[PDB]
């Protein structure tokens, strides 16, 4: 029966490929050819956040666009005031090897995790005024790669165990487990409505997940190597993924296929982070080649370059209002560009 | 806006306190040497952890040598797809690669050699030295001294290999045991010496799972790694 299973899966994949080909009447690049390109935009380092001891690996902007949380593997999780550079909080982590951080939309809680396989929740606004561990989510069997708050009580977490999990913070139990990814899940992105999220899992495939239904709604396999970064297009109908193949690819939840690819011959290194501007015209992706390329989401060209970082870029995030984009790096410095 | 400036002053005070705390943490961190313990599951790395200590995805073993803080990390409960979580250990002082030299048949020795090749050739680990603990030396001695499990069957170049004149075997070991030991060592040197960049160095060590010197071996390896890094910075290497 296993051979019949292989044959059936192969012909199902062929059918889906044919269906995607049928919808491919015209590519995004050709349709967007007539639009005026963004041209050349030169974003410069506006704020340099210093204080992290080890290399920074994750970051997340707050909804207020003022406070931001960053994670470095020195056992410290610093919250920075973007406007003044003042560190609002400096949370010592029980596990040094933190790989993810998340700032709650209301800002009352912060989550982080890593090789400890625990997504620790930190309460920033305890009545005593101190920051203390609120809940420890230890049900994952692998390193936490990414985490994102749906709300003060719901957090989606990705783990090295190749499965994503939806956690109820108050009870600290897996409300729903997302299985289907063959490889290690690296990045998470919550949709604007918080009803859908996508992730790439080291299998060159991106999967669409239903937060409430808890099932794999769609799968995308445009990439050639491990996907390290994923982010929805600001409208929530599409998302871009960064992969070790040195290319970014845009996928639409309705077309169910790769709309376009962002790449150039000189870039051979892997991709660590990807994010969209508020309008979604600019795709900002962090690269292993020590700089970040600004990609025109429509015209398929590099609109700009952020070459201020001295080490690998690990994380990249744009403020919800789009005022500025902050790029983290392995040099232990966060640079805010605008 | 007097209230805004008062809030700014309070934030500045909090920032200064956080700067003091981060300076203390930096002083502690730079004085602490992180070590990644890695190797085959069937290897003796767990026994070495037990000697040094005498559900989580990573285990912290803290030990002191000559009042020097060492934070050895054992990566347990993690899937064997190491290419991602291994990248987190680029800044560790050394990677303690524990290989059971006697685990040649699956041929776990060849798997360990491939894992060492990946570790050495990884882009982000090119700055990290590897402490190669050639563990299970007694098992290898027993296997080769009074066993027909010929090494050259699983390593044909072994029949052509000869013990280097620079070898310093333990007095009493049979010539075959020393030959196999140094053959395995040089096979691991295939990767370490092939790069030739001098950016990071490998420190093979013939070790047994219960040797107390292993801690001293790690201490000496860290000394050598730091000294070589400083010398290369000073153009002396």
């Amino acid at each position, epitope marked *: 029966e296993l051979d019949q299973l292989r044959q059936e899966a192969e012909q199902l994949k062929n059918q889906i490929r044919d269906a995607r080909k049928a919808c491919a009447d015209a590519t995004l690049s050709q349709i967007t050819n007539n639009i005026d390109p963004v041209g050349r935009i030169q974003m410069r380092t506006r704020r340099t956040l210093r204080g992290h001891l080890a290399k920074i690996y994750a970051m997340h902007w707050g909804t207020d666009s003022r406070l931001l949380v960053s994670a470095s593997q020195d056992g410290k999780l610093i919250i920075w005031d973007s406007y003044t550079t003042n560190k609002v909080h400096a949370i010592p982590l029980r596990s040094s090897w933190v790989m993810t951080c998340a700032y709650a939309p209301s800002g009352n809680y912060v989550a982080c995790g890593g090789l400890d396989n625990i997504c620790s929740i930190y309460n920033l606004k305890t009545r005593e005024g101190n920051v203390r561990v609120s809940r420890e989510l230890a049900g994952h069997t692998g390193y936490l790669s990414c985490c994102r708050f749906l709300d003060d009580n719901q957090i989606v977490t990705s783990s090295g165990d190749t499965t994503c999990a939806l956690w109820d913070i108050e009870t600290g139990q897996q409300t729903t487990t997302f299985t289907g990814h063959t490889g290690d899940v690296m990045s998470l992105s919550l949709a604007p409505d918080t009803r859908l999220f996508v992730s790439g899992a*080291c299998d060159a495939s991106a999967k669409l997940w239903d937060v409430r239904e808890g099932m794999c709604r769609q799968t995308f396999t445009g990439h050639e190597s*491990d996907i390290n970064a994923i982010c929805f297009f600001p409208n929530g109908n599409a998302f871009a993924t960064g992969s*070790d*193949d040195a290319t970014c690819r845009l996928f639409d939840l309705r077309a169910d296929q790769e709309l376009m690819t962002y790449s150039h011959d000189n870039i051979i290194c892997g991709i660590t982070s990807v994010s969209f501007s508020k309008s979604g015209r600019l795709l900002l992706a962090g690269y292993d080649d020590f700089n970040c390329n600004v990609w025109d989401a429509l015209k398929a060209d590099r609109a700009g370059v952020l070459a201020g970082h001295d080490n690998r870029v690990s994380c990249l995030g744009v403020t919800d209002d789009g005022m500025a984009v902050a790029t983290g790096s392995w040099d232990s410095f966060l640079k805010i560009w605008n | 806006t007097e209230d805004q400036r008062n809030e700014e002053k309070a934030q500045r005070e909090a920032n200064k306190k956080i700067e003091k705390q981060l300076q203390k943490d930096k002083q502690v961190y730079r004085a602490t040497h992180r070590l990644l313990l890695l190797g085959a599951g069937e290897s003796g790395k767990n026994t070495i952890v037990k000697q040094m200590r005498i559900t989580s995805g990573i285990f912290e073993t803290k030990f002191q040598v000559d009042k020097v803080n060492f934070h050895m990390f054992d990566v347990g409960a993690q899937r*064997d797809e*190491r290419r991602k979580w291994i990248q987190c250990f680029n800044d560790v002082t050394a990677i303690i690669f524990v290989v059971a030299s006697s685990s040649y048949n699956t*041929n776990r020795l060849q798997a360990a050699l491939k894992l060492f090749d990946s570790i050495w050739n990884n882009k982000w680990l090119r700055d990290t030295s590897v402490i190669l603990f050639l563990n299970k030396q007694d098992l290898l001695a027993e296997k080769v001294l009074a066993g027909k499990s010929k090494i050259e069957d699983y390593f044909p170049e072994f029949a052509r290999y000869t013990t280097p004149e620079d070898a310093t075997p333990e007095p009493g070991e049979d010539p075959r045991v020393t030959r196999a030991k140094y053959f395995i060592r040089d096979e691991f040197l295939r990767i370490s010496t092939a790069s030739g960049d001098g950016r990071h160095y490998c420190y093979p060590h013939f070790t047994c799972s219960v040797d107390t010197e292993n801690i001293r071996r790690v201490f000496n390896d860290c000394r050598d790694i730091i000294q070589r890094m400083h010398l290369r910075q000073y153009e002396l290497l």
Partner: nanobody
């Protein structure tokens, strides 16, 4: 979609030859280091041989050195493993495995857990 389809295999007498093939698709074949791994009945996955991107560098496991020949042809996105003088111990399912990232000689595809960039595998059986 990353696809690796091994072809060739089946019963073969000891001491014979067997030319395995691997049709690659969905990625730039030349940009990734390729290698062969096998899983004999009851034993774990074992690395057999690897070939660099350009094919100028090749390595074989000691039990395979001088017995099997690994070759690749980037012109048709295919990888080969020319097996000669097969032994009974060689009986195993040979999985055509690709290394994770391109342009890097690093490789982490001997993982026991399900590896995404290895093919279904072709059964190779050696019997008298």
């Amino acid at each position: 979609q990353v696809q690796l389809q091994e072809s060739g295999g089946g019963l073969v007498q000891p001491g014979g030859s067997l030319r395995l093939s691997c049709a690659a698709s969905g990625f730039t074949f030349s940009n990734y280091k390729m290698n062969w791994v096998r899983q004999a009945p009851g034993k774990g996955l074992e690395w057999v041989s690897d070939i660099s991107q350009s094919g100028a560098s090749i390595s074989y496991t000691g039990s395979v050195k001088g017995r099997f020949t690994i070759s690749r042809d980037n012109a048709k996105n295919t990888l080969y493993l020319q097996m000669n003088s097969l032994k009974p111990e060689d009986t195993a399912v040979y999985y055509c495995a690709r290394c994770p990232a391109p342009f890097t000689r690093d490789c982490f595809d001997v993982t026991s857990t399900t590896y995404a960039y290895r093919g279904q595998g072709t059964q190779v059986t050696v019997s008298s």
